[PDB]
Design a protein around this ligand. Structure first.
Ligand SMILES: [Mg+2]
Ligand SMILES: [Mg+2]
Ligand SMILES: [Mg+2]
Ligand SMILES: [Mg+2]
Ligand SMILES: [Mg+2]
Ligand SMILES: [Mg+2]
Ligand SMILES: [Mg+2]
Ligand SMILES: [Mg+2]
Ligand SMILES: [Mg+2]
Ligand SMILES: [Mg+2]
Ligand SMILES: [Mg+2]
Ligand SMILES: [Mg+2]
Ligand SMILES: [Mg+2]
Ligand SMILES: [Mg+2]
Ligand SMILES: [Mg+2]
Ligand SMILES: [Mg+2]
Ligand SMILES: [Mg+2]
Ligand SMILES: [Mg+2]
Ligand SMILES: [Mg+2]
Ligand SMILES: [Mg+2]
Ligand SMILES: [Mg+2]
Ligand SMILES: [Mg+2]
Ligand SMILES: [Mg+2]
Ligand SMILES: [Mg+2]
Ligand SMILES: [Mg+2]
Ligand SMILES: [Mg+2]
Ligand SMILES: [Mg+2]
Ligand SMILES: [Mg+2]
Ligand SMILES: [Mg+2]
Ligand SMILES: [Mg+2]
Ligand SMILES: [Mg+2]
Ligand SMILES: [Mg+2]
Ligand SMILES: [Mg+2]
Ligand SMILES: [Mg+2]
Ligand SMILES: [Mg+2]
Ligand SMILES: [Mg+2]
Ligand SMILES: [Zn+2]
Lengths: 175, 142, 38, 209
RNA sequence: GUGAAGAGGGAAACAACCCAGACCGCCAGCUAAGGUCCCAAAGUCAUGGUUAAGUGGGAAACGAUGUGGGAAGGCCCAGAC
RNA sequence: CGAUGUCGGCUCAUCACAUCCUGGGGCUGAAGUAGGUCCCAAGGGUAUGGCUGUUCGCCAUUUAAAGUGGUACGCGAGCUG
RNA sequence: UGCUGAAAGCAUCUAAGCACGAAACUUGCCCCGAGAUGAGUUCUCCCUGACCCUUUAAGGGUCCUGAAGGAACGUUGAAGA
């Protein structure tokens, strides 16, 4: 609807290929590909992508608005990239990177190693901070969710892996 | 006079190939059970098998509507006391996909010795190929 | 997770959402308010 | 990995230096020689067919003796078959020695157990005997009740009752191999394998590791 | 009113419900209730809607931005939400 | 009612899940340990004695736990009496 | 429990798409198992005679032939009523 009516402007240096329902968006940061729902009609009006309900479908504007914000995110991913920052709160908690294997040390009896996916690159500025970058927004949010999932932050001290921007509602242990 | 009956020695039967890609399960199966019974022939006789041999291929690509791909359940019982078993539709396609067409048609044929003889003419295949080129089967469109 | 027959908004931050055929109350503020109709 | 066909020689013990007595089962393993190599193009699966021992020449039948003559090998006392893993192959007339188990550590020994004959439910299914006194009328080792009243006019399938015990294929898993003596064709596994003395055994490397 | 003392058809099976009262014969026709995808006789009928729950094909107080239709209202290109 | 043997024990059981243990979770007035509570889950496991005809119950001492029910208050052409 | 994400400029685990998640489920382990009448597969072995017949057909008979193998018998078994 209101999201889908607003067209997505392709910048310069961003190659867009429409192919049925398959759309490959290239750029200086990589290529991204997504098969759309069959309820979505996509067409390139020479500087913008537009998004209309294909006929004979119930959720016309609902599927189109999903198809808008994805290809909006595919454009921003191939010209800027996404960057999700994580920090580690807790004594002795740290992280190290070996190419694409983040080596977490989260107070377990066993080492924690996380294999990174394909288009995702990570970096630790500090031992208690993880910064990971990449193109696809769904994937960097997934990797950030996986690294958060090892130590979901305790409400009594905020201890554990958190997002660098989120708020952690704490709790006092009463007596 | 008396009403004609078909005779099992003089009856002739034919061969058909049906492609089951994308077709609805029950709407395919009722046309197979119509043609295995022999109710498309004017010389139909209830106590005589007058139907046609039918080869069904691409049995793993049959389609069902709704949520029945994950919610239609095929129960059976092994005879032993805990022996209730259970498989969903998409597990049956992965495990042994020929049974799905076979179970649907077997429920639509008559029950008895003749209905089991009608089921022997249904020859289903998961793949896109068959060893029955020697019988010269025609392409049946359903 | 409260599981009830009657699920209701308990504060201003409750949001009634239907996830997979189940009416669910989720609250960003209070974890006591999260509900599930069952 | 394939296994080998041996024979239960008997049991003995290996005194270690440390003062530990290991109860071992001597399994002589003669040279298993392959008789047929099975593959995907002809047979649908990958396996080999081996033979061991000797057999009286007047007793091996013409269908059976022709099967050894195609492989070109002496007739053995039986024919067994071992499924092949991938990347593992054998020729037809190849002989396989007990040095195959030189570097395994646990094996599974499959044999036919001893025949207990028609056994009652005290012996077979470990039922409790009833009371040997206090009034018991002719019912000291009987199975007792076997069902319920009218709800299931019937005894269920697989009800534990009397019948044949033993004389059947059983497999003891994860037996520690003690010694592999290639010179006199032996194989010492820790513990007791199924079968009587002199019966055929199938020794395979342990699948549960 | 039916059964008892009443068969036939339908309701899976089902004295008492629904349709209908068996003098006999027929390898004739029309209908009733109930039905017409297959088991199983007859519409894969037509036109216009509704449902996405296998609801249909078992149940309440109560709960819910499920969804379809209608009538009204207060905010609103003086810029709302 | 021209016979459907009955309380408890014994010996075989078998099913349900409204779960006692073990498994997975949510919330906690959840620091940890240990809990409370609810959700999912029936795969396996699930005492021995004292007293009493007892089921039950109390008591002693165990155990990860000593589940609740259906089964003609399961089971006498199997036993006990 | 999530990720991305609209319908509903926000929000949202879901409607499209994706990820994780239990002794349950299907496998993995063991055993039976082609009467699986849908009766499967592989390998090897054995038989390469003459004639009559009328109702001429998956026909009946004669003489010659008797294989591979099996069965019976005997000695028996850590197999067995
Ligand atoms: Mg779910
Ligand atoms: Mg409840
Ligand atoms: Mg014996
Ligand atoms: Mg006793
Ligand atoms: Mg007596
Ligand atoms: Mg006695
Ligand atoms: Mg009785
Ligand atoms: Mg019965
Ligand atoms: Mg009377
Ligand atoms: Mg009547
Ligand atoms: Mg009637
Ligand atoms: Mg009824
Ligand atoms: Mg009837
Ligand atoms: Mg008419
Ligand atoms: Mg009518
Ligand atoms: Mg019938
Ligand atoms: Mg019909
Ligand atoms: Mg129509
Ligand atoms: Mg405003
Ligand atoms: Mg009486
Ligand atoms: Mg009587
Ligand atoms: Mg439950
Ligand atoms: Mg808890
Ligand atoms: Mg069970
Ligand atoms: Mg149990
Ligand atoms: Mg079960
Ligand atoms: Mg299991
Ligand atoms: Mg007691
Ligand atoms: Mg009762
Ligand atoms: Mg009783
Ligand atoms: Mg009980
Ligand atoms: Mg009794
Ligand atoms: Mg007395
Ligand atoms: Mg959004
Ligand atoms: Mg979100
Ligand atoms: Mg998974
Ligand atoms: Zn709230």
């Amino acid at each position: 609807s209101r999201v889908a009516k607003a067209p997505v402007v392709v910048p310069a240096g961003v190659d867009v290929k429409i192919n049925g329902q398959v759309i490959t968006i290239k750029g200086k940061n990589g290529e991204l590909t997504r098969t759309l729902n069959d309820a979505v009609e996509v067409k390139h009006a020479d500087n913008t992508l537009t998004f209309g309900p294909r006929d004979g479908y119930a959720d016309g504007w609902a599927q189109a608005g999903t198809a808008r914000a994805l290809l909006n995110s595919m454009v921003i991913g191939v010209t800027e990239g996404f960057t999700k920052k994580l920090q580690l709160v807790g004594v002795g908690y740290r992280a190290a990177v070996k190419g694409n294997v983040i080596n977490l040390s989260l107070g377990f009896s066993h080492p924690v190693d996380h294999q990174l996916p394909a288009g995702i690159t990570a970096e630790c500025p500090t031992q208690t901070e993880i910064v990971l970058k990449g193109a696809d927004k769904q994937v960097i949010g997934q990797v950030a969710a996986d690294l958060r999932a090892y130590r979901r932050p305790e409400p009594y001290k905020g201890k554990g892996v958190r997002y660098a921007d989120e708020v952690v509602r704490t709790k006092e242990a009463k007596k | 006079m008396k009403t004609f009956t078909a005779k099992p020695e003089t009856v002739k039967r034919d061969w058909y190939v049906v492609d089951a890609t994308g077709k609805t399960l029950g709407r395919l199966a009722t046309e197979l059970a119509r043609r295995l019974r022999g109710k498309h022939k004017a010389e139909y006789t209830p106590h005589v098998d007058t139907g046609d041999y039918i080869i069904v291929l691409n049995a793993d690509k049959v389609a069902v509507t709704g949520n029945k791909r994950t919610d239609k359940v095929y129960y059976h019982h092994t005879g032993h006391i805990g022996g209730i078993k259970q498989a969903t539709f998409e597990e049956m396609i992965a495990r042994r996909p020929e049974r799905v067409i076979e179970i649907a048609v077997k429920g639509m044929l008559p029950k008895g010795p003749l209905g089991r003889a009608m089921f022997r003419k249904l020859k289903v295949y998961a793949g896109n190929e068959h060893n029955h080129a020697a019988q010269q089967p025609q392409v049946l469109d359903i | 997770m409260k599981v009830r027959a009657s699920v209701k908004k308990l504060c201003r931050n409750c949001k009634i959402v239907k996830r997979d055929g189940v009416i669910r109350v989720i609250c960003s503020a209070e974890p006591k308010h999260k509900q599930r109709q069952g | 990995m394939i296994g080998l066909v041996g024979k239960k020689v008997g049991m003995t013990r290996i005194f270690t230096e440390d003062g530990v007595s290991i109860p071992v089962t001597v399994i002589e393993v003669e040279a298993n020689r392959v008789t047929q190599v099975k593959d995907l193009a002809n047979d649908g699966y990958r396996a080999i067919q081996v033979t061991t021992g000797a057999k009286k020449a007047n007793r091996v039948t013409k269908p059976e003796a022709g099967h050894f003559a195609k492989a070109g090998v002496e007739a053995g006392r039986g024919l067994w078959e071992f499924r092949l893993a991938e990347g593992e192959e054998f020729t037809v007339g190849q002989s396989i020695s007990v040095e195959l188990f030189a570097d395994v550590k646990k094996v599974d020994v499959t044999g036919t157990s001893k025949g207990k004959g028609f056994a009652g439910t005290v012996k077979r299914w470990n039922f409790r005997t009833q009371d040997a006194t206090h009034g018991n009328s002719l019912s000291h080792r009987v199975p007792g009740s076997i069902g319920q009243n009218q709800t299931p006019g019937k005894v269920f399938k697989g009800k534990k009752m009397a019948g044949q015990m033993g004389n059947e294929r059983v497999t003891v898993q994860s037996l520690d191999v003690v010694r592999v003596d290639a010179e006199r064709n032996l194989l010492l596994v820790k513990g007791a394998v199924p079968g009587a003395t002199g019966s055929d055994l199938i020794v395979k490397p342990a699948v549960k590791a």
